[PDB]
Amino acid sequence: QYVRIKNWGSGEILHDTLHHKATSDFTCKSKSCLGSIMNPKSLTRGPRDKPTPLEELLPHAIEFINQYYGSFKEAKIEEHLARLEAVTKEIETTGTYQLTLDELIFATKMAWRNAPRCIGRIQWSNLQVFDARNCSTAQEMFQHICRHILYATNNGNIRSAITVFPQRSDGKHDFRLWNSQLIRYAGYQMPDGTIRGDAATLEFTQLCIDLGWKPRYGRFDVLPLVLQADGQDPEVFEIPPDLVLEVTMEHPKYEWFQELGLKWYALPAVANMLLEVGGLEFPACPFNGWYMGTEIGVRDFCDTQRYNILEEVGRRMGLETHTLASLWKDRAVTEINVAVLHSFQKQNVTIMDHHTASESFMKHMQNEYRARGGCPADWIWLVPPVSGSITPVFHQEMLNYVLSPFYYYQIEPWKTHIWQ
Amino acid sequence: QYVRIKNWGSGEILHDTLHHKATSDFTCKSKSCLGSIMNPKSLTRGPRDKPTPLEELLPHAIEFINQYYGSFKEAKIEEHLARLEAVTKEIETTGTYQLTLDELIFATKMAWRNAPRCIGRIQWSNLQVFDARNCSTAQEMFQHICRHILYATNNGNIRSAITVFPQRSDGKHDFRLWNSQLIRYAGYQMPDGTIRGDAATLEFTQLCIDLGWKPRYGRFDVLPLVLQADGQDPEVFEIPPDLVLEVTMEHPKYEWFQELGLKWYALPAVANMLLEVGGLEFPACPFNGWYMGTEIGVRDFCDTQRYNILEEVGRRMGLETHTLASLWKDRAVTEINVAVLHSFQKQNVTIMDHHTASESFMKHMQNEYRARGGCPADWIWLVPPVSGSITPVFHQEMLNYVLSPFYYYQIEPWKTHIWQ
């Protein structure tokens, strides 16, 4: 029938009918909840040896073409019927099929729409699609990615975009970006026991250096693009510095803040995800939106396993840093966040604070239920890393499910790559 | 086999074998996660008409006696064997069985140990058990509850305790406390459109007044105990004011804070939950621990649906209250929290800040996995309503499951009570 969902802040009740269209088995079990797991098999789509079995491809394909044509106000039935026949003809002829640019565009926005862990989804229809399905060399990959970065940045006025490379064919000719993010800082373990830069990119920076990247041993060293084209080994490309736009941090009160020598790139671009749509799969399709302050201020800067700056931001604020109960950490993190938002605001670079983000998502969630009867949502990811219950999303009960199209995680490439 | 769990902050990995001992079907489905739902059927144990089917009672009973005797270092096998026989003899003779005080004590601590939504579980073995299984009248219920409140309070030096009333027999002679909490404030809808006190207790305060309670139309009016004994209708009892200990709020810097006229009761006591153990069920068994600042500071005070004080605490702090992006809400909530912790600390009343709480739970979680191979945990409840990722629990992946004994929710009594 339907599932009842309540918003404990507003008292409003909603009915979820959309979960009925969910793929196959998800994260949890009959006797336990595992929604707390970061990378479950259910959110991951791995490698392939042989092409996709046609008995599987065709129904998926037909369902996608049905969804696409079922999406315009006053559909084109003769076009719909023609497309179904052509797709079937193509599947039986070539072993697979090609999406029209229009279908791809629709696929990319819908997969974003279906991303349960994204707060920015109110923006789902504003997405620029770069068709790089004709690509064949790593060098061409690199050029496409540069156009992306250039377009996306727009000199601070961030624009959301995605660039789709060739779809998986047999499974041994996959196009992959070995980077987690398009733009990201390096993390080196220093001689003195410490770690500089991004502790999260440790194992990867080591891979980059092993493929011959020149380690600039600093704290904000933008790592290189590590591209895998067709079946080939990955090639290393340096990101043109002119393309990488950053924001240096500074507080509108605490003038000693900038003396911390902190900054962050203005571009949040997921590089290693896979787009599934109508039986097809694209293992290389980097995408970007704009940042939400907490990503940088709370997670990037304050996480133990990342930059870890809390200890000294507390010190430099006076604060009893050795008395947990004093709530210094609460004090600092709040200031590190106004810095980020001020620094981004001042330097004319798009940013979104978590409160306005949460409020926009709530508006989106209502639009979604009204428009299609549901919105797949992952509360654990959707609730900001700070000020939990101060945001509307905390009081909203939600359902998490995998629809199609969708953006999946992939098993990291170095673990499955057959080098030549 | 076992489930792999990772702590993304420390890199530590853990194996969960305990989830194999989980009861029956939990919250989620084959195709979707619903761990975000507040009151799912899986966390609730409802009404009964007829006694418990013996085919069900006996295995459950035997399993509990096996667990109990399997719990002491160097067990008493002849006592274990004797207890199994006696329990079986009693079940076949009287239709049910009675727990020894020692087994009850063990049951109450283990059910607490198994509460996936409790952060304070490191304390699980320090629990005072009040045996009120001999009780028969509402007046005796009221006396027991008063002894509880008195003992628990200890004049600020809060002590954890539970008071167990008679177990469900046929299902139509249930002992129930109609209150959500032992001590709790009233919420009235005022003439001027507003609402005073606790907006959460609206529908209930109306029930109290309908059973003849005298509405003192204030903002901190401690509601009456509404007791249901044997099968009978509920009787209303006023909580002796001398028993109710409160804490008035005041900031160690902002002297205008106390002029807000704010306070909160020093006793967090869940009144409406059901204890299940070895086939048996106790529908009345109120329990208490001590408070965690955020409960009062963030949830009680700042929630829209509760006291809702943010708007004016912001105003009285200067803050641009009409500019979301200014992060005023972050600023205020932090101060409302130091107040609570200071006010509680000054007035010599036990309290625990969320950071130290999170750290103690993490230590408990490790002790648990080491001791029994798991710890049922609900990330959505365990992560504080503020400073999410600043706490260790946010980075800890966890598994949520229902073991036995356990504390269940119950369908609210007014919805199922056959009045006489």
Ligand code: HEM
């Ligand atoms: C327009 C601005 C957007 C904002 C403000 C936004 C914000 C966010 C935030 C805050 C996260 C969590 C990041 C993390 O904790 O790792 C996220 C994740 C995500 N976003 Fe959005 N997003 C936007 C646009 C997009 C776009 C354009 C796409 C795809 C076309 C997208 C796809 C996703 C996906 C798949 C995730 C999950 C990533 C993962 O699982 O690691 N987002 N987004």
Ligand code: HEM
């Ligand atoms: C010793 C101090 C303790 C602390 C600091 C503590 C703290 C907490 C906190 C912060 C919550 C969440 C409250 C909410 O958000 O509604 C909670 C819930 C809970 N606690 Fe503990 N607790 C303690 C002792 C106990 C005891 C003694 C029991 C039982 C014998 C217990 C049983 C539970 C249960 C069942 C819940 C879930 C309540 C619900 O689902 O509404 N706690 N505790």
Ligand SMILES: C[C@H](O)[C@H](O)[C@H]1CNc2nc(N)[nH]c(=O)c2N1
């Ligand atoms: C273990 C836990 O799942 C993990 O720390 C989470 C929680 N919620 C999150 N939320 C977001 N948006 N991003 C994250 O990285 C995480 N990680």
Ligand SMILES: C[C@H](O)[C@H](O)[C@H]1CNc2nc(N)[nH]c(=O)c2N1
């Ligand atoms: C909808 C959502 O489940 C709800 O707001 C939650 C989340 N986590 C919580 N955590 C605690 N400890 N207490 C709560 O009341 C809640 N409620």
Ligand SMILES: [Zn+2]
């Ligand atoms: Zn689940």
